[PDB]
Amino acid sequence: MLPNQTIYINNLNEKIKKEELKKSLYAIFSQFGQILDIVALKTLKMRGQAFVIFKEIGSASNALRTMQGFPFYDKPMQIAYSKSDSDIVAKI
Known part of the structure; x- marks a missing residue:
């Protein structure tokens, strides 16, 4: 699976309000480089x-390889590159 600028995260704690979840995701992912957007509906x-959309593909790679399994709100994140442009859209 070729790297791309967007990482797809699952196994996130569903008890957390989305506004808070997005701010907390920025807190941990901003170190990898410029973030264009975070989507969690x-x-x-x-x-x-x-989804965390980085400006640079390399940032997405470093994020994926570093934070794989990191326990976030006491649940290990599962991270993958997004499979296609149609992917977010499908999720809306």
Whole structure:
């Protein structure tokens, strides 16, 4: 799976309000480089999931390799590169 600028995260703690979850994701991912956006909706389709869109592909790679399994709100994050441009959109 080729690297791309967006990482897809699941196994996120669903008890956390989305505004807070997004701020906390920025807190931990901003070290990897400039973040263009973080998406985490309170829809059934997006339960436990988020996308972090980095400016640079290399930042997404370093984020993925460093934070894989990191216990965030006491739950290990599962991180993958996004599979395609149509992916976020499908999740809305």
